[PDB]
Amino acid sequence: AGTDTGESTATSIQTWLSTWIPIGCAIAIMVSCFMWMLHVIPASFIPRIVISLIGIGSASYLVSLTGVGS
Amino acid sequence: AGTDTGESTATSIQTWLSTWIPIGCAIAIMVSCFMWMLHVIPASFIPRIVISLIGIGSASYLVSLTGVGS
Amino acid sequence: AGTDTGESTATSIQTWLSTWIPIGCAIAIMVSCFMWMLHVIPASFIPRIVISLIGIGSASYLVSLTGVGS
Amino acid sequence: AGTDTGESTATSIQTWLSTWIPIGCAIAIMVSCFMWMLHVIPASFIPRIVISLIGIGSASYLVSLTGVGS
Amino acid sequence: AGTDTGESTATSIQTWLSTWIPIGCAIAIMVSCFMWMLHVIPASFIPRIVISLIGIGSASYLVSLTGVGS
Amino acid sequence: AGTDTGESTATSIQTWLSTWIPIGCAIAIMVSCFMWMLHVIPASFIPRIVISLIGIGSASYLVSLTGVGS
Amino acid sequence: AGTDTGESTATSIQTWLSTWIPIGCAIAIMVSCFMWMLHVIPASFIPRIVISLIGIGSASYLVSLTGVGS
Amino acid sequence: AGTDTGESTATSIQTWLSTWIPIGCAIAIMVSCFMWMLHVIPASFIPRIVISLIGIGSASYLVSLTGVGS
Amino acid sequence: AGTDTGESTATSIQTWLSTWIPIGCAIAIMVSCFMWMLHVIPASFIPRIVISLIGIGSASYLVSLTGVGS
Amino acid sequence: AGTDTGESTATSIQTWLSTWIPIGCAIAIMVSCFMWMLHVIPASFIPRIVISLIGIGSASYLVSLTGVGS
Amino acid sequence: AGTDTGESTATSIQTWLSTWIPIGCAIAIMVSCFMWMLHVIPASFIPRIVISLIGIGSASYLVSLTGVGS
Amino acid sequence: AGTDTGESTATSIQTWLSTWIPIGCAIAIMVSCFMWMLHVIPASFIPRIVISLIGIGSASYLVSLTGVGS
Amino acid sequence: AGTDTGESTATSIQTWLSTWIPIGCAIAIMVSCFMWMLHVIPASFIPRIVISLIGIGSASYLVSLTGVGS
Amino acid sequence: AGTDTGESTATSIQTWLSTWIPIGCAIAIMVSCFMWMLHVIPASFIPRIVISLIGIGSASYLVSLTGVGS
Numbered sequence: 001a002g003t004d005t006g007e008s009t010a011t012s013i014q015t016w017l018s019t020w021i022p023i024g025c026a027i028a029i030m031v032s033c034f035m036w037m038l039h040v041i042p043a044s045f046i047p048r049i050v051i052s053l054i055g056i057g058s059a060s061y062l063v064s065l066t067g068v069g070s
Numbered sequence: 071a072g073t074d075t076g077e078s079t080a081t082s083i084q085t086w087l088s089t090w091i092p093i094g095c096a097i098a099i100m101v102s103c104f105m106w107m108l109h110v111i112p113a114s115f116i117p118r119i120v121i122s123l124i125g126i127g128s129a130s131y132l133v134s135l136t137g138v139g140s
Numbered sequence: 141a142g143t144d145t146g147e148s149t150a151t152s153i154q155t156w157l158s159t160w161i162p163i164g165c166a167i168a169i170m171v172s173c174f175m176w177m178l179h180v181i182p183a184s185f186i187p188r189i190v191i192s193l194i195g196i197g198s199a200s201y202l203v204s205l206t207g208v209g210s
Numbered sequence: 211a212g213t214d215t216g217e218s219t220a221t222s223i224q225t226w227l228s229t230w231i232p233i234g235c236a237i238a239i240m241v242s243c244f245m246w247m248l249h250v251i252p253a254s255f256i257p258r259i260v261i262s263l264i265g266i267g268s269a270s271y272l273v274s275l276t277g278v279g280s
Numbered sequence: 281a282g283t284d285t286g287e288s289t290a291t292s293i294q295t296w297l298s299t300w301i302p303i304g305c306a307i308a309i310m311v312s313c314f315m316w317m318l319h320v321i322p323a324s325f326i327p328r329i330v331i332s333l334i335g336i337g338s339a340s341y342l343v344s345l346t347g348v349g350s
Numbered sequence: 351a352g353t354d355t356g357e358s359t360a361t362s363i364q365t366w367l368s369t370w371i372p373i374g375c376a377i378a379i380m381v382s383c384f385m386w387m388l389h390v391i392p393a394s395f396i397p398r399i400v401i402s403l404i405g406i407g408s409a410s411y412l413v414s415l416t417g418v419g420s
Numbered sequence: 421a422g423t424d425t426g427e428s429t430a431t432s433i434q435t436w437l438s439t440w441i442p443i444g445c446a447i448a449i450m451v452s453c454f455m456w457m458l459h460v461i462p463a464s465f466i467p468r469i470v471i472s473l474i475g476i477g478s479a480s481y482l483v484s485l486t487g488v489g490s
Numbered sequence: 491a492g493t494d495t496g497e498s499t500a501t502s503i504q505t506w507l508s509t510w511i512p513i514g515c516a517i518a519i520m521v522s523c524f525m526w527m528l529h530v531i532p533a534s535f536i537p538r539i540v541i542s543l544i545g546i547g548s549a550s551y552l553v554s555l556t557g558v559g560s
Numbered sequence: 561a562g563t564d565t566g567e568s569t570a571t572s573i574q575t576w577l578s579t580w581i582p583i584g585c586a587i588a589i590m591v592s593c594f595m596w597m598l599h600v601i602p603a604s605f606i607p608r609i610v611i612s613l614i615g616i617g618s619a620s621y622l623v624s625l626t627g628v629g630s
Numbered sequence: 631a632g633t634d635t636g637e638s639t640a641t642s643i644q645t646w647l648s649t650w651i652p653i654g655c656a657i658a659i660m661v662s663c664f665m666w667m668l669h670v671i672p673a674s675f676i677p678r679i680v681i682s683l684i685g686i687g688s689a690s691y692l693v694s695l696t697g698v699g700s
Numbered sequence: 701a702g703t704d705t706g707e708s709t710a711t712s713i714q715t716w717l718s719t720w721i722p723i724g725c726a727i728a729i730m731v732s733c734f735m736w737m738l739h740v741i742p743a744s745f746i747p748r749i750v751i752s753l754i755g756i757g758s759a760s761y762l763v764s765l766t767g768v769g770s
Numbered sequence: 771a772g773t774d775t776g777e778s779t780a781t782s783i784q785t786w787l788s789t790w791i792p793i794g795c796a797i798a799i800m801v802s803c804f805m806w807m808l809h810v811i812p813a814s815f816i817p818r819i820v821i822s823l824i825g826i827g828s829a830s831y832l833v834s835l836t837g838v839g840s
Numbered sequence: 841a842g843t844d845t846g847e848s849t850a851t852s853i854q855t856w857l858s859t860w861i862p863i864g865c866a867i868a869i870m871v872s873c874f875m876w877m878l879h880v881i882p883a884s885f886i887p888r889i890v891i892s893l894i895g896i897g898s899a900s901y902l903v904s905l906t907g908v909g910s
Numbered sequence: 911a912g913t914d915t916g917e918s919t920a921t922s923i924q925t926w927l928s929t930w931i932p933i934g935c936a937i938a939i940m941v942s943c944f945m946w947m948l949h950v951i952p953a954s955f956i957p958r959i960v961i962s963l964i965g966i967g968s969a970s971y972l973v974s975l976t977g978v979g980s
């Protein structure tokens with residue numbers, strides 16, 4: 001009697017986040033490198049950025065790799 | 071019914087930081103060289119400054135190199 | 141039938157804080173430098189004071205930069 | 211309907227600290243020089259004392275230099 | 281409603297230290313000369329003792345020379 | 351036909367509290383400093399005491415600053 | 421119709437604490453110095469004891485310095 | 491209606507500690523000298539033991555020197 | 561027409577508790593020290609035990625110190 | 631009309647714990663020394679074991695030393 | 701109405717650990733000597749192994765030496 | 771006129787739980803050790819498992835030790 | 841009147857976990873070694889993996905060793 | 911009534927990691943050698959890389975060597 005807005009709403013939210021999450025990732029790299037130059041944080045932040053970027057781009061693939069939502 | 075201020079807000083914050091982050095980088099180079107002259111810190115700070123400057127200028131390129139936000 | 145005291149009350153609170161927040165900032169600089177002389181805290185407090193002062197003076201500009209309240 | 215004790219309280223606290231902070235600074239110089247004589251700490255404490263004294267005496271000037279509280 | 285014990289406490293601590301710090305300085309000179317006789321430490325300790333004694337006796341003068349606490 | 355005991359009762363309660371609230375504030379400062387000496391609580395209690403004292407003495411002024419009860 | 425036991429009760433509690441708080445302060449100094457000898461805690465505890473003792477003896481003066489309870 | 495066990499309890503605890511703290515101090519001197527013989531720790535432990543012993547024996551005098559508990 | 565069992569009942573309950581509360585206090589000291597040995601809880605429990613014992617033995621005196629029940 | 635099981639129950643619990651708490655203390659010493667050999671924890675655990683053993687054996691004496699339960 | 705499994709459980713755990721803790725101690729000696737050959741760690745590990753072995757074999761004796769569990 | 775099913779029902783419930791509670795205890799040990807390997811929880815879970823196992827096996831004995839149900 | 845699914849359900853859950861817990865343990869070893877290569881975590885993770893593996897394989901034996909569920 | 915995705919999900923995650931963990935290991939060797947050339951880190955990193963590579967390739971074998979998951 002109505003419209004199913006469950007799948008569409010979830011897809012719309014996913015599309016919206018991808019608009020500005022990538023820009024926020026670039027900000028963190030610039031700010032983190034600045035803090036490292038000032039001797040505020042250790043250098044163990046470099047591997048974190050690469051691993052986090054792997055997870056962000058592989059989010060959809062990882063979920064289906066476990067059999068959920070197929 | 072409104073305006074999307076997700077991408078614009080992230081871009082505005084990125085533009086603002088680039089106004090004064092470069093000046094802060096020059097301050098660190100001057101202060102770090104002063105501390106080295108006083109025998110307070112080792113000389114291993116020189117490679118750090120070059121590597122940090124590489125990361126700051128390559129932040130946007132590095133993010134898209136991993137496929138995020140394209 | 142009455143008076144709108146929403147904008148005025150918020151403005152009055154903002155004006156009151158600016159009277160004594162700046163004096164409190166000077167106290168922290170003096171006390172933090174004293175603790176550093178005593179070998180109680182590391183020197184990574186110096187960049188914090190500059191960054192915090194940037195945020196305090198740019199509070200109004202930063203809010204409107206994101207499109208809120210215009 | 212009352213009295214504003216925001217600016218006065220902050221000023222009173224600042225005036226009180228300046229009574230005994232300078233005496234504490236002289237104690238640190240005497241004790242630090244003693245520890246250096248005993249071969250307990252390195253000589254990199256001498257530049258710290260001068261820099262800390264610069265910050266303590268310039269606390270008020272530095273805050274207004276950034277535009278806060280004017 | 282009470283008594284201010286900020287300046288007095290700092291002065292009392294300064295007076296107490298001067299009672300036994302000078303005796304400790306004489307002990308270091310005697311022990312350091314003994315170690316030098318045994319070929320345990322280099323002779324670069326002699327200039328350190330003179331410079332440390334200059335700093336201990338000039339602690340109060342040096343603090344006010346920078347404008348702090350006047 | 352009677353007496354209005356609304357404003358008087360509120361004023362009487364306010365006057366009574368001011369008799370012993372200030373003494374209770376001094377107790378907290380003494381006890382809090384004792385706990386800090388014992389390594390039981392962090393040093394972030396010092397700014398709390400100053401801010402709370404500002405609020406207690408400015409209670410009447412703050413209420414009228416928002417236009418209530420004038 | 422009764423007796424006001426607000427100011428008296430607060431004063432009585434303050435007087436009681438001053439009987440045994442000073443003895444507890446001496447215990448902490450003795451125990452803290454013992455732990456330092458055993459290489460369990462750093463030497464940054466010495467400035468804490470002096471600052472805490474300043475606060476304990478100045479509790480009443482500090483409260484009235486801000487205008488509360490006068 | 492009862493007995494005040496605030497001052498007595500604090501005094502009893504102080505008396506108990508002095509029974510075995512001095513013996514523990516002698517153990518540390520013997521063990522620390524052993525570790526030094528084995529080339530495990532530097533010789534900067536010798537000044538620490540003297541300074542700690544000064545603090546332990548002067549705990550009561552130091553507290554009253556600041557005006558607390560008199 | 562009957563017997564007043566208000567004061568007697570309260571006194572009887574107080575006497576009963578004092579029979580086994582002290583034994584329970586000794587159990588806590590033994591168990592708390594065991595947990596500390598196992599690195600389960602911090603050492604800030606030691607001051608708590610002394611302060612709690614002061615309160616337990618001074619319960620009757622503290623109540624009458626405030627003027628209640630005299 | 632019944633039996634008082636307040637003092638007896640507390641005594642029974644105390645006696646039960648002393649059966650196996652001492653064996654648990656020996657386990658901790660053996661395990662802690664093993665972890666130290668593996669370079670997992672610092673050597674500041676040795677003074678903790680001695681102090682904890684002092685507290686466990688002196689639990690009953692310490693409680694009565696403060697006047698509780700006599 | 702049941703069985704006391706407090707002393708037995710503690711004894712069983714102690715017996716189990718002694719089965720494989722000694723083998724783990726031999727592994728550490730072999731691995732630590734290997735790291736020393738590679739110039740990765742200093743030679744101050746040799747005294748640690750002897751002292752740790754003394755503590756492991758004397759765990760039960762040390763506990764009863766202090767009067768606990770007898 | 772009927773049958774007393776009070777003691778029997780309580781005994782039956784106790785017997786049923788002992789069938790699968792022990793298996794659940796083994797699951798927790800396996801899962802807790804897995805979480806520790808992943809750096810999700812601290813190592814203070816090991817003493818908890820031993821103490822909980824002591825309580826489970828001594829439930830009946832502990833109840834009668836206090837005189838209840840005999 | 842029904843079927844007892846208490847012991848069977850607990851056994852079924854235990855059997856299911858053992859299917860994939862071992863594979864998860866191998867993943868942690870591979871990932872932990874990778875983080876160590878990157879200088880992100882200390883080397884004290886190696887003893888943890890061995891001890892955790894001992895606990896996982898001995899879960900059933902350890903539970904019955906204490907007398908629970910026999 | 912469904913599908914068991916416990917073993918398969920764990921296996922899939924293990925297979926995915928092996929795709930890019932080896933490439934990350936080669937990056938660390940290249941970067942670590944660069945830092946060594948610049949006199950930033952000591953040469954004790956060479957044995958770490960070999961030992962970490964041994965652990966990564968032996969993860970599955972080591973787990974079953976202890977009896978887990980067989």
Ligand SMILES: CCCCCCCC/C=C/CCCCCCCC(=O)O[C@H](COC(=O)CCCCCCCCCCCCCCC)COP(=O)(O)OC[C@@H](O)CO
Nearest residue numbers: 099103111112113114116117118119120121124947948949
């Ligand atoms: C994209 C690729 C980027 C690669 C990374 C950038 C590389 C830039 C060069 C530096 C490292 C060169 C290789 C290592 C040289 C060999 C190692 C060496 O000589 O050791 C020290 C450095 O000396 C040295 O060279 C010292 C001089 C090195 C610097 C050369 C001049 C550069 C400009 C100077 C202003 C800084 C500007 C920083 C931003 C660019 C000794 O010295 P000094 O006895 O003091 O004891 C310091 C301490 O030990 C005190 O405790």
Ligand SMILES: CCCCCCCC/C=C/CCCCCCCC(=O)O[C@H](COC(=O)CCCCCCCCCCCCCCC)COP(=O)(O)OC[C@@H](O)CO
Nearest residue numbers: 042043046047049050118125878879934938941942945951
């Ligand atoms: C898919 C697989 C991904 C794998 C993970 C990514 C790997 C990327 C490389 C980093 C780790 C390399 C292995 C470890 C190197 C050996 C360990 C080492 O050298 O240690 C520090 C790092 O130095 C170093 O190399 C420092 C340089 C390492 C980084 C190399 C250049 C990268 C670009 C730079 C901009 C960042 C962009 C981040 C996003 C990509 C010393 O340094 P620094 O004395 O400062 O004391 C810092 C601190 O100790 C201060 O408290």
Ligand SMILES: CCCCCCCC/C=C/CCCCCCCC(=O)O[C@H](COC(=O)CCCCCCCCCCCCCCC)COP(=O)(O)OC[C@@H](O)CO
Nearest residue numbers: 038039094098101102105111182183186187189190258265
């Ligand atoms: C908008 C952009 C803003 C950018 C952010 C502001 C930047 C302002 C400069 C600071 C960082 C400079 C770069 C880092 C310098 C290289 C790193 C360095 O030298 O390390 C320490 C700092 O030394 C140092 O320079 C110490 C001196 C640095 C400060 C220079 C003088 C400033 C005035 C002083 C009063 C404070 C006023 C704060 C408000 C302005 C060593 O020291 P110290 O052996 O003590 O061991 C401390 C600790 O390790 C003890 O545990």
Ligand SMILES: CCCCCCCC/C=C/CCCCCCCC(=O)O[C@H](COC(=O)CCCCCCCCCCCCCCC)COP(=O)(O)OC[C@@H](O)CO
Nearest residue numbers: 107108109251252253256257259260324328331334335342
């Ligand atoms: C606004 C700008 C401010 C700038 C900052 C202030 C500058 C004030 C001078 C100091 C640094 C000079 C540059 C560095 C000198 C070259 C480096 C040098 O010589 O090294 C050490 C210092 O020696 C030295 O000079 C030692 C002497 C330096 C101090 C000169 C006399 C000053 C008064 C003395 C009382 C202190 C009062 C502090 C408050 C003013 C050797 O020594 P020493 O073998 O002991 O091994 C110590 C350790 O290595 C033991 O582990």
Ligand SMILES: CCCCCCCC/C=C/CCCCCCCC(=O)O[C@H](COC(=O)CCCCCCCCCCCCCCC)COP(=O)(O)OC[C@@H](O)CO
Nearest residue numbers: 164168171172175181220392393396397399400468471475
């Ligand atoms: C209107 C505007 C009001 C503004 C608010 C009031 C401001 C008043 C100053 C305090 C904050 C200063 C800025 C922060 C200083 C930099 C931060 C710093 O040093 O950190 C700690 C504080 O040390 C410190 O300074 C400690 C000293 C700070 C206090 C200075 C003396 C004040 C009098 C003392 C009696 C109390 C009376 C309270 C009522 C007035 C270290 O310490 P401590 O190693 O112990 O580890 C404690 C913990 O971490 C243990 O777990």
Ligand SMILES: CCCCCCCC/C=C/CCCCCCCC(=O)O[C@H](COC(=O)CCCCCCCCCCCCCCC)COP(=O)(O)OC[C@@H](O)CO
Nearest residue numbers: 248249304308311312315320321531532533536537539540
């Ligand atoms: C109230 C005032 C109190 C003032 C404080 C007390 C002062 C008591 C004297 C000590 C410091 C003397 C001044 C410094 C001497 C000059 C500095 C010196 O010689 O350096 C080291 C100490 O040597 C030395 O003297 C070593 C000998 C110094 C001690 C003299 C005999 C004292 C009794 C011995 C039993 C301890 C009892 C401790 C409690 C009293 C070399 O040594 P060693 O090559 O080993 O490398 C150790 C390490 O570097 C290994 O890594």
Ligand SMILES: CCCCCCCC/C=C/CCCCCCCC(=O)O[C@H](COC(=O)CCCCCCCCCCCCCCC)COP(=O)(O)OC[C@@H](O)CO
Nearest residue numbers: 178179234238241242245251290462463466467469470545
């Ligand atoms: C109102 C104003 C008040 C101002 C605040 C009070 C000031 C009172 C002096 C202390 C700080 C002096 C300035 C800092 C000195 C320079 C810094 C310094 O030397 O560092 C440590 C302290 O050494 C030192 O001086 C140690 C000696 C400092 C103390 C001097 C004697 C005081 C009496 C002793 C009994 C305590 C009584 C406490 C209540 C009064 C080294 O040491 P140690 O190798 O052990 O490594 C400890 C750790 O690093 C181990 O992990």
Ligand SMILES: CCCCCCCC/C=C/CCCCCCCC(=O)O[C@H](COC(=O)CCCCCCCCCCCCCCC)COP(=O)(O)OC[C@@H](O)CO
Nearest residue numbers: 388389444448451452455461500602603606607609610685
């Ligand atoms: C009326 C007035 C009463 C005043 C209150 C009573 C005072 C009684 C003394 C305690 C506090 C002393 C001042 C603080 C000391 C300086 C602070 C200090 O050393 O810190 C810890 C305590 O160490 C320490 O001293 C530990 C030893 C302190 C206790 C001294 C022996 C007492 C008897 C022992 C049995 C208990 C009986 C309790 C009932 C009496 C370090 O330790 P540990 O590395 O373990 O890390 C623990 C944790 O951090 C682990 O997460």
Ligand SMILES: CCCCCCCC/C=C/CCCCCCCC(=O)O[C@H](COC(=O)CCCCCCCCCCCCCCC)COP(=O)(O)OC[C@@H](O)CO
Nearest residue numbers: 527528529729733741742743744746747748749750751754
């Ligand atoms: C109950 C009482 C127990 C007492 C404690 C046990 C005592 C057992 C002996 C050791 C300490 C002897 C006293 C100190 C010796 C004088 C100090 C000395 O020589 O210094 C180092 C040790 O050298 C040395 O002796 C090195 C040799 C010392 C060991 C002698 C052979 C022992 C067996 C070997 C297998 C280990 C088995 C461990 C378990 C038993 C130099 O060396 P190396 O240039 O390498 O720079 C290492 C580093 O500096 C690299 O950074």
Ligand SMILES: CCCCCCCC/C=C/CCCCCCCC(=O)O[C@H](COC(=O)CCCCCCCCCCCCCCC)COP(=O)(O)OC[C@@H](O)CO
Nearest residue numbers: 458459514518521522525531672673676677679680748755
């Ligand atoms: C009632 C009064 C009680 C008083 C309290 C008890 C006192 C019992 C002695 C210990 C402290 C002695 C004073 C401090 C010694 C000087 C300080 C010292 O040497 O430092 C460490 C301890 O070394 C050391 O002595 C290590 C040896 C100290 C222990 C001496 C043998 C005791 C038996 C051994 C089995 C344990 C049984 C515990 C229950 C009794 C170095 O070491 P290690 O390079 O490893 O770096 C560890 C870490 O830094 C690694 O991160």
Ligand SMILES: CCCCCCCC/C=C/CCCCCCCC(=O)O[C@H](COC(=O)CCCCCCCCCCCCCCC)COP(=O)(O)OC[C@@H](O)CO
Nearest residue numbers: 598599654658661662665671710812813816817819820895
């Ligand atoms: C009746 C009397 C019962 C008494 C109670 C039972 C006692 C059983 C032993 C444990 C405590 C030993 C005393 C404390 C040891 C000294 C303290 C110590 O070493 O600390 C941690 C534990 O390490 C350690 O020993 C870790 C090893 C301790 C366990 C020894 C092997 C036991 C079997 C293993 C499977 C579990 C089976 C559980 C059921 C029996 C460090 O570790 P790790 O760096 O990981 O940081 C963890 C965390 O800090 C991460 O955030």
Ligand SMILES: CCCCCCCC/C=C/CCCCCCCC(=O)O[C@H](COC(=O)CCCCCCCCCCCCCCC)COP(=O)(O)OC[C@@H](O)CO
Nearest residue numbers: 737738739939943951952953954956957958959960961964
């Ligand atoms: C399964 C069993 C595995 C066993 C573990 C692997 C073993 C692989 C060899 C290394 C250790 C050899 C034993 C120790 C040698 C004796 C000790 C020695 O010489 O000391 C340093 C290392 O020098 C040296 O050899 C330096 C050369 C050692 C390496 C030999 C060539 C290897 C390939 C190179 C690319 C890395 C690839 C890493 C992955 C395979 C001096 O140097 P350098 O003055 O620089 O001061 C560095 C620092 O002190 C600066 O602060």
